[PDB]
Amino acid sequence: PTLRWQEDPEPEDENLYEKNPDSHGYDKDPAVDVWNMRVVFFFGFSIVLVLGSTFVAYLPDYRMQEWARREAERLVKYREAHGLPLMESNCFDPSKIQLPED
Template sequence: RWESSSSRAVIAPSAVVGKRAPEPTMRWQEDPDPEDENLYEKNPDSHGYDKDPVVDLWNMRVVFFFGFSIVLVLGTTFVAYLPDYRMQEWARREAERLVKYREAN
């Protein structure tokens, strides 16, 4: 005999032994989404941009051209030729010029 601690309900052993939990029914279905095809089987040199090997190669070249040539080369050139930050270099040159002028007079 089993007795619940919270509700003090008593369940007779014959009631528990005779019943089993119903087993869940499984319905097998086909996967609606097919597996992704492996591009490396068709094109072992795939870069992951396109299924067509020629388009894939050109996409990789374009990405690396713009990624390295344009961003890195032109970006560092832009930063190198930025104007004098807060005119610090100009202020030093002007101070040296004024010191030389005052020493001469």
């Protein structure tokens, strides 16, 4: 014989269609919804996505990659011309060592 409440039946469902069939995602203000569609496709795709594609498609030599390609080509031709085998092992100088004796 008591209620513990005073409020409306929750919720009050409002369909976002059926007042604007020409509406996009949010509220029935017909101008700013078109403004949102325009800004999300122009300032979100048309100036961001394809420009980012052209930006990341080519840029300087990332991790000095093709620099290392041409450097390795010149170094292999250099070491083939000077008779020594390519990739001299023991990259640090074996004369430049001070071993702990035993």
